[PDB]
Amino acid sequence: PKKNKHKRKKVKLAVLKYYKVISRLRRECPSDECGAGVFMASHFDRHYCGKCCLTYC
Amino acid sequence: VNTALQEVLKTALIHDGLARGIREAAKALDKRQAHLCVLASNCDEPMYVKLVEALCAEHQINLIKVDDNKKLGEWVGLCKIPRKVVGCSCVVVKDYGQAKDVIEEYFK
Amino acid sequence: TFSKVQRFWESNSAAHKEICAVLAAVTEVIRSQGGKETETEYFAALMTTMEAVESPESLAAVAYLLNLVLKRVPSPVLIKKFSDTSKAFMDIMSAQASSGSTSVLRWVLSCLATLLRKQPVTLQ
Amino acid sequence: PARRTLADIIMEKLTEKQTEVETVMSRVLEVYRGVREVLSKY
RNA sequence: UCUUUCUCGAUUCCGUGGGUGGUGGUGCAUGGCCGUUGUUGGCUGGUUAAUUCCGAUGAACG
Numbered sequence A: 001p002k003k004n005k006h007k008r009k010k011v012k013l014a015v016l017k018y019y020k021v022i023s024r025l026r027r028e029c030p031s032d033e034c035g036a037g038v039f040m041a042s043h044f045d046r047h048y049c050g051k052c053c054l055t056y057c
Numbered sequence B: 001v002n003t004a005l006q007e008v009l010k011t012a013l014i015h016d017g018l019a020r021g022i023r024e025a026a027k028a029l030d031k032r033q034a035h036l037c038v039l040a041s042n043c044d045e046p047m048y049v050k051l052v053e054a055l056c057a058e059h060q061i062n063l064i065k066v067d068d069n070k071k072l073g074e075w076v077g078l079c080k081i082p083r084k085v086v087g088c089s090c091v092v093v094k095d096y097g098q099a100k101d102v103i104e105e106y107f108k
Numbered sequence C: 001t002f003s004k005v006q007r008f009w010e011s012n013s014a015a016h017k018e019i020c021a022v023l024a025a026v027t028e029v030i031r032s033q034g035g036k037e038t039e040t041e042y043f044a045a046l047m048t049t050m051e052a053v054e055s056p057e058s059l060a061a062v063a064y065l066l067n068l069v070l071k072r073v074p075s076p077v078l079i080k081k082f083s084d085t086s087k088a089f090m091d092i093m094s095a096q097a098s099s100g101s102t103s104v105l106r107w108v109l110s111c112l113a114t115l116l117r118k119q120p121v122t123l124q
Numbered sequence D: 001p002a003r004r005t006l007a008d009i010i011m012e013k014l015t016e017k018q019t020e021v022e023t024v025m026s027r028v029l030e031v032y033r034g035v036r037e038v039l040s041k042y
Numbered sequence E: 001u002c003u004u005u006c007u008c009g010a011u012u013c014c015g016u017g018g019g020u021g022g023u024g025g026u027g028c029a030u031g032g033c034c035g036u037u038g039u040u041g042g043c044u045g046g047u048u049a050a051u052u053c054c055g056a057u058g059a060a061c062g
């Protein structure tokens, strides 16, 4: 029962998923500080914001 | 023209404005606060090197082309005194602090 | 000769305790409307605010000056246009009684007492 | 109409004064009421 | 903490050295500082039966 530390999953080229070729594949946050650069998660049942924890279902 | 660019990047590190890295260049450019963009010409993958000029023209941002990235990295402050020499393929200056007038008249 | 309503617009001690604020100088020199005290032409100019405008805290700030100014004896003026004032407020007594506010309501009842103090239709 | 015309001029001057005052100036409580009492004895 | 990847980015994280590493408790001399051995003056706001409740907000004489 040793306390193992979390290791962050090194996703290879995580930058290269929000666009094709032009436009944005993912959603953008409608908040003031978050948005125009802040992408949203696209989960199988929800949308999640990595900055202000905004949740849309 | 590179001599007139070394002064405006140096005062950006003094005022801590510029954003190094591809994603920091991407995040700052579409926030309508970016002022100029620097692109390294030695990019192996062509899918991301052609995105940056599409993004800046959409947000009406001018573009500066530089041949080297490791030389770009050591100029923008990615080296310590240099033992480790690393570079970035893109960097965007957020805000400024003589030749900055020379740089802005070059586009016109 | 305006902007007195916008001086009461801010509710802060930094701009309430000033001499230029409504604490002291409004009670002295604004009664001289145009330099002569006291002209009721201001209250006879804001009917478009007391009619067809129910914006809160704008009718409240005009209610402050309505109570504050009429203390300084426009009594011959009060006699002639008493009916004009009475119809200008008997409809106010019905209007936000249907809405249910207090801040617009408390000073307009005091200025009614102010005009009634200086003075068949009167008992209504 | 003369009284109504002066009313518009009084309203136009007052609205310009409201912008001048702003230029010179230039449900969340109760949920945050709960969390500070949580922080009082956390 | 154990999975599904969402987001911050230099603020970095892995190992090896016989190479350095007091937030100690306790007593004495030690400089400043409190307490210790009279007299006269002087309201934006919401709250309640109620100048009710909460919120901002001085001087000489012996």
Ligand SMILES: [Zn+2]
Pocket (backbone or CB within 6 Å): B023
């Ligand atoms: Zn990254």
